[PDB]
């Protein structure tokens, strides 16, 4: 059966390219017969965003010719913290636990404010202590991963986590990304003003949720992948953009 | 001054060197966005040229102010076969002001332009193609015709209220208005529609009921240009100038 990559991005004050504000992004992986439902889902997701009404949006589909790999979601643990500063401290400890040196963590945190506007993810090289990709404000956009809702809902029931598509999306991405042999860890929180939970993820500790990573009403987010590998960055960028992943949980 | 949006679509098969299946352009208020994205989607998905494996749909705010014009006057020439239609087409182009030699040269090149995805600009002073877009063609966009007014026009005009005619006539009308455009020649690349037209400022929109045989995918869109200025000026006008059609019943 043939699957399709469906992607969306939306911005205001022009195309993202112009120097507009990123509003929303989406990526889906589906059989052809879900095309209409999926295009509408992405349209609606872009139109009803807390960051604002877009004046630019692109939606796109194409056939995927690489074969699909189906994986488990990462194990999930929720860390309850009382404030953003405690969440950020915990985040740094978790990154160090997973194998990132403290020094590389500090260098990344120096740039993170600069990367608030990035539309995808930043790749940070642990060998240089510096950004590895050259996409600048565009970022690297991981795509061609998805998680059928029914299975995701079964997973959320069991995990005592709410069945919000925001978590599905985050965990599908974290799971695809941590599977990459060159990715040691990911740090994330949302650019949406209305969601303060973030996470750190890696192969050892799984998907570590942190219930407060920033204040409500702020639009600064973070998506950094810490890279430890022997290959060029374009190889890895191609892996993240092109490798098709479906999530399927079983107990 | 109400805000309008350019909504565009293109679809192809065997990739993004692929076969062009469908193209669309709309110009609408924001509240029509959902209906319009779905219309373009469905248009692309149910095309007689085939099922796409690639599609892009895009919207953006238009910042130039909209000009509203009347549609060209319409006349329908009933012919009994394609060869009679083509012969009429050439007579009408000549009557509107294109010299015979320029018509003959263009007809010799029309077969090699079957694959062009937009329009060809043909210079009447040089008897040569003027634009440099090759297989891409020049894609006129940011024109539309609100459905209600189009339906009233079609009722009165004794022409069927098909969106194909709406789209053709909105384009022909925007294009003929351009002071450098002497005439247009058109028939569809769709295997399932053999009606075509020639259009110009004097003769209006002259429909010709048979311009090719059913089941053929060779189409034509040629703009005959009489102009001193940089072709890129004209191209920019055709791509960027926002036009709405309003037929005035009161007349
Ligand atoms: N597909 C992607 N590829 C690379 N970076 C991405 C991608 N998607 C999002 N990002 C980056 O992350 C930033 C925020 O993305 P968002 O979709 O706003 O991210 C979230 O909602 C994070 C929620 C995690 C906690 C969920 C939970 O377990 O309760 C976003 O602006 C991008 O810069
Ligand atoms: N927006 C455009 N800008 C430039 N060229 C275009 C555009 N739209 C279509 N074309 C070119 O023309 C070709 C034919 O497009 P189509 O939309 O398939 O053409 C038609 O339906 C023609 C119908 C005319 C008769 C209507 C009537 O019954 O009164 C198409 O493949 C392109 O090469
Ligand atoms: Mg997202
Ligand atoms: Mg966001
Ligand atoms: Mg068309
Ligand atoms: Mg066509």
Curated annotation (Swiss-Prot), chain B:
Q: Which domain of life is it from?
A: Bacteria
Q: Which pathway does the database say it acts in?
A: Metabolic intermediate metabolism; pimeloyl-CoA biosynthesis; pimeloyl-CoA from pimelate: step 1/1
A GO MF annotation of the entry reads: ATP binding
Secretion signal span: none
Question: What's one GO BP annotation on this UniProt entry?
Answer: biotin biosynthetic process
Listed under catalytic activity are: heptanedioate + ATP + CoA = 6-carboxyhexanoyl-CoA + AMP + diphosphate
**EC number(s) per entry:** 6.2.1.14
Spell out where the chain crosses the membrane: none
Which top class of enzyme applies to this chain?
ligase
Which UniProt keywords are listed? ATP-binding, Biotin biosynthesis, Ligase, Magnesium, Nucleotide-binding
User: Which cofactors?
Assistant: Mg(2+)
**Database matches in Pfam families:** BioW (PF03744)
Q: What does this protein do?
A: Catalyzes the transformation of pimelate into pimeloyl-CoA with concomitant hydrolysis of ATP to AMP.
Q: Which family does it belong to?
A: Belongs to the BioW family.
Describe the protein's quaternary organization and the partners it interacts with. Homodimer.
Which HAMAP family does the protein's record reference?
BioW
Q: What is this protein called?
A: 6-carboxyhexanoate--CoA ligase
């Amino acid at each position: 059966e043939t699957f399709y990559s469906v992607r969306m991005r939306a911005s205001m004050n022009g195309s993202h390219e112009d120097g507009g504000k990123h509003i929303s992004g989406g990526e889906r992986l589906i059989p052809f017969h879900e095309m209409k439902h999926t295009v509408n889902a992405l349209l609606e997701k872009g139109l009803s965003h807390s960051r604002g009404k877009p004046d630019f949006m692109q939606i796109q589909f194409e056939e995927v010719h690489e074969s699909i790999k189906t994986i488990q979601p990462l194990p999930v643990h929720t860390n309850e913290v009382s404030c953003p500063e405690e969440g950020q401290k915990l985040a740094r400890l978790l990154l160090e636990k997973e194998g990132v040196s403290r020094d590389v963590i500090e260098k990344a945190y120096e740039q993170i404010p600069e990367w608030s506007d990035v539309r995808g993810a930043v790749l940070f090289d642990i060998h240089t202590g510096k950004r590895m990709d050259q996409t600048k404000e565009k970022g690297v956009r991981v795509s061609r991963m998805d998680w059928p809702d029914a299975n995701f809902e079964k997973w959320a029931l069991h995990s005592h986590v709410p069945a919000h598509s925001r978590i599905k999306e985050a965990l599908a991405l974290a799971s695809k990304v941590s599977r990459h042999p060159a990715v040691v860890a990911e740090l994330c929180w949302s650019d949406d003003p209305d969601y303060i939970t973030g996470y750190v993820a890696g192969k050892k500790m799984g998907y570590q949720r942190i219930t407060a990573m920033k204040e409500y009403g702020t639009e600064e987010g973070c998506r950094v992948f810490f890279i430890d590998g022997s290959n060029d960055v374009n190889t890895y960028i191609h892996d993240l953009e092109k490798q098709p992943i479906l999530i399927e949980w079983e107990e």
